[PDB]
Design a protein around this ligand. Structure first.
Ligand SMILES: C[C@H](CO)OC[C@@H](C)OC[C@H](C)OC[C@@H](C)O
Ligand SMILES: C[C@H](CO)OC[C@@H](C)OC[C@H](C)OC[C@@H](C)O
Ligand SMILES: O=C(O)c1cc(I)cc(I)c1O
Ligand SMILES: O=C(O)c1cc(I)cc(I)c1O
Length: 583
């Protein structure tokens, strides 16, 4: 009854500003092609109704579920069908089915214009109206990333306000702002991929997959906490992530604030690093908790072999509650090994399971399971080796060269994937060298497997919507935890039928000359993928010969008196020499 006024309750708990920011984010993520001006109106209508409900909770409609009021507002958008086609059909449904329907139409690759920073323009807008400026920011990010973790987005608006406040008083605005925006953009993209993975886990592997992942991660972060404190927190946190992934953004933010306050209330049982966070206002406090460094491993923890290999009762304990016993193995192993990746720790738990399945049926189980850590070694040696060979390859060739070697690998592994996605994924995979090869020894495996999971999840999300490789389907869907090693093991897809040589990718207009460097590399990388789709067994020398010819040709025509003339009239030679080189 009273708290049937969910909207008043959210408005009271979050305050007007956050309430509006979250409602704006929600409309932007479901209706990614509506203009800001439209969404601002819908936000203001809901905020007014919220204020009415707050003054009187018995006003008509104040008892509806917030997520029902929100859906209803979606359904009352006049251009809903015009713009979102089928999406309109979702309106014929009852909740929760309606929402699930809408969520199905979130577009992970909306291919919205690139937002290129005009420092003076940004600053004029920021000076004119700070609130509108931040609103437009939330809307641009949220419509491009319809799974962006909403409370963090509110945070990135707040944190970066100082940016604009400082920068926009400077005479040289561009020199001040541009580095900061690049940094902002980097934070955003990583935050987006991370949340997109959490929402994919929950949807494709279920809530329990995200819980296991979080047990391992939180046991590393707060290794002094009790198992049951970690599971309480992971459960609350996974609820918050679920609510955010399902578009329940105000309940999401409200739950996260309670979680943040719970963690600060119990900081002494969790981690001494939390002291930093616990006197901050709520968005910042939450952000700081999500980013806290791993606490030190306490002293005097028994060796893992005591409960899990040496003990005579392993089988009985396992048999009485497998899930608890294995959750507990995962907690005990994670808290002791901050230098292992979460996904490696989950692999270790899975193999430990398979071992006791095998061992607990035998005549003498103890003799078999006592040596289990020897059997697990390989799951630690394989990632370290992956890092060692790829980092050496990265440092031998640098980022661009490492990207190209990954283009060659991935195009062979999944040559049916569209060329822009293979390029996009391969360039990100190459950047995992830039982000992780130089890290401390104990951060390298966590850094590498985490970024790999984010980027492979991105390939899985794109592929799930237009499946074209059965091997990608298998590695995306068979096991979240083994995704990375499943992709790692793929070899040249032997069922693939090469395409004819696609010349357009080796033919250009004069405006290639003025492309930003990044775009120029993407041009060469596109060409490289297309070489491999045509001749997947091309040799390193043939690939090198073709690309060198390519760059030499582009240089030559960009030097010409008549650039378009040289590209058009000489262009057939590059095409011919490229084909000659692949013989
Ligand atoms: C209605 C309004 C746009 O006019 O909505 C957006 C607004 C509430 O932005 C919230 C955002 C978190 O505030 C940023 C800080 C720096 O004030
Ligand atoms: C599910 C996982 C493979 O993803 O491996 C099994 C194991 C790690 O389960 C952990 C899970 C969080 O159990 C915790 C229960 C006891 O509270
Ligand atoms: O994902 C988060 O936002 C997050 C938020 C809180 I509060 C605490 C933890 I640990 C988190 O990891
Ligand atoms: O932050 C998480 O909770 C998280 C969850 C999953 I599933 C995968 C990665 I990499 C993560 O960082």
């Amino acid at each position: 009854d009273t708290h049937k006024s969910e909207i008043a309750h959210r408005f009271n708990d979050l305050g007007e500003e956050n309430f509006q920011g979250l409602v704006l984010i929600a409309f932007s993520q479901y209706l990614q092609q509506c203009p800001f001006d439209e969404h601002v109106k819908l936000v203001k209508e809901l905020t007014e109704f919220a204020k009415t409900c707050v003054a009187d909770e018995s006003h008509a409609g104040c008892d509806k579920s917030l997520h029902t009021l929100f859906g209803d507002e979606l359904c009352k958008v006049a251009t809903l069908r015009e713009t979102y086609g089928d999406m309109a059909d979702c309106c014929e449904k009852q909740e929760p089915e309606r929402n699930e329907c809408f969520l199905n139409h979130k577009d992970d690759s909306p291919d919205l214009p690139k937002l290129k920073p005009e420092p003076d323009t940004l600053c004029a807008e920021f000076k004119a109206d700070e609130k509108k400026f931040w609103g437009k920011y939330l809307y641009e990010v949220a419509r491009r990333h319809p799974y962006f973790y909403a409370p963090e987005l509110l945070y990135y608006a707040n944190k970066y306000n100082g940016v604009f406040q400082e920068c926009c008083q400077a005479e040289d605005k561009g020199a001040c702002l541009l580095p900061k925006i690049d940094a902002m953009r980097e934070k955003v993209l990583a935050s987006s991929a991370r949340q997109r993975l959490r929402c994919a886990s929950i949807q494709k592997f279920g809530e329990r997959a995200l819980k296991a992942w979080s047990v391992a991660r939180l046991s590393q972060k707060f290794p002094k906490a009790d198992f049951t404190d970690v599971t309480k927190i992971v459960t609350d946190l996974t609820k918050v992530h679920k609510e955010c992934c399902h578009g329940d953004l105000l309940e999401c933010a409200d739950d996260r604030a309670d979680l943040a306050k719970y963690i600060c209330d119990h900081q002494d049982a969790l981690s001494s690093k939390l002291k930093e966070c616990c006197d901050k206002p709520v968005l910042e406090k939450s952000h700081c908790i999500a980013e806290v460094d791993k606490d030190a491993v306490p002293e005097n923890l028994p060796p893992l072999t005591a409960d899990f290999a040496e003990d005579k009762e392993v089988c009985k304990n396992y048999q009485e509650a497998k899930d608890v016993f294995l959750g507990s193995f995962l907690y005990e192993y994670s808290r002791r090994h901050p230098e292992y990746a979460v996904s490696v720790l989950l692999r270790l738990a899975k193999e430990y399971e398979a071992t006791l399945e095998d061992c607990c049926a035998k005549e003498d189980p103890h003799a078999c399971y006592a040596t289990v850590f020897d059997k697990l070694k390989h799951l630690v040696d394989e990632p370290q080796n992956l890092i060692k060979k790829n980092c050496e390859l990265f440092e031998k060739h640098g980022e661009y060269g490492f990207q190209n070697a990954l283009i060659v690998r991935y195009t062979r592994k999944a040559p049916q994937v569209s060329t822009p996605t293979l390029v996009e994924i391969s360039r990100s995979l190459g950047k995992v060298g830039t982000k992780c090869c130089a890290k401390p020894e104990s951060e390298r495996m966590p850094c590498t497997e985490d970024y790999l999971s984010l980027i492979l999840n991105r390939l899985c999300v794109l592929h799930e919507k237009t499946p074209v490789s059965e091997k990608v389907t298998k590695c995306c869907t068979e096991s979240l935890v083994n995704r990375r090693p499943c992709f790692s093991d793929l070899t040249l897809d032997e069922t693939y039928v090469p395409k004819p040589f696609d010349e357009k990718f080796f033919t250009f207009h004069a405006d290639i000359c003025t492309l930003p460097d990044t775009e120029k590399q993407i041009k060469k990388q596109t060409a490289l993928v297309e070489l491999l789709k045509h001749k997947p067994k091309a040799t390193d020398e043939q690939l090198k010969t073709v690309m060198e010819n390519f760059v030499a040709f582009v240089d030559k025509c960009c030097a010409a008196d008549d650039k378009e003339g040289c590209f058009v009239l000489e262009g057939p030679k590059l095409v011919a020499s490229t084909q000659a080189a692949l013989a």
